[PDB]
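Objective 1b of the project was to move from sequence-level analysis to a structural picture of ligand recognition. The entry below was assembled by the postdoctoral researcher (A.K.) and checked by the PI before modelling. It contains the amino acid sequence of the target and the SMILES of the bound compound, MLQ.
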Amino acid sequence: SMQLNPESADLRALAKHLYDSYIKSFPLTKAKARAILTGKTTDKSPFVIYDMNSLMMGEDEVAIRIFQGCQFRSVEAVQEITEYAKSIPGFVNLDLNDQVTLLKYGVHEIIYTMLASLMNKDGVLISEGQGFMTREFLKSLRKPFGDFMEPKFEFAVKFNALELDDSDLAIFIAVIILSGDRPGLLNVKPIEDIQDNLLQALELQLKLNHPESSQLFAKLLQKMTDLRQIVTEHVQLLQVIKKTETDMSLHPLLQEIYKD
Ligand SMILES: CCCCCC[C@@H](Sc1nc2ccc(NS(=O)(=O)c3ccc(Cl)cc3Cl)cc2s1)C(=O)O
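Corresponding predicted holo structure:
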């Protein structure tokens, strides 16, 4: 279109609203993370866990302790996403079973999207920017726990190459949540209508925000495929440890989601 009219103004207002919700819902944004990660004289300096010795210092089997850290964080992450979901124009207006469904099947895609914010070539920022854990350390975890994040790193470096900002991600995450094709949705049409509008919002945001890159919209939409594969892969990984590791157990609120 390339026209500043009433429809385009609404799409900006929607972009602004989602951004503001995202800032309120999500405490460590991408902008902060990038700043910390690039040594942009952010308030304090995270402790770098690169081995067993460095981990014991910072922690002021490990494979189990770290795995249980990632489930605890995963739980809070769902709070954050629940709160953001509820800020999306038309969302609370939907059947409760649909709302609950969209989140059942959304939260992991969103989790692995946001985790990319915390990652570079070297590793991931942990506990709101106070720690950094290396990729090679996480790989070196006792099998099969060395296998979990490697694929998220592989996703992230591809994803981070798109160079999206918090304003981009805000709309993107909304688009993901309102996915018409989740199992056992009563009313598809109303969800698809919100997503069509979110997709208009995104296409506009990207055009305005990314002069120097085309088929960014498309390359971004393709990422939703990579996200599905990552979640699928992640589940077949959770499946295996439940057999092998018949000595531990996994937070029940996650178990509700992890059987469908
Ligand atoms: C203090 C212990 C450090 C870990 C805590 C997690 C960090 S951020 C974070 N958040 C999630 C959320 C999900 C995942 N899923 S995952 O990548 O497949 C994964 C990688 C390794 C292991 Cl051992 C298990 C798992 Cl599930 C990982 C992470 S890492 C935080 O701020 O607290």
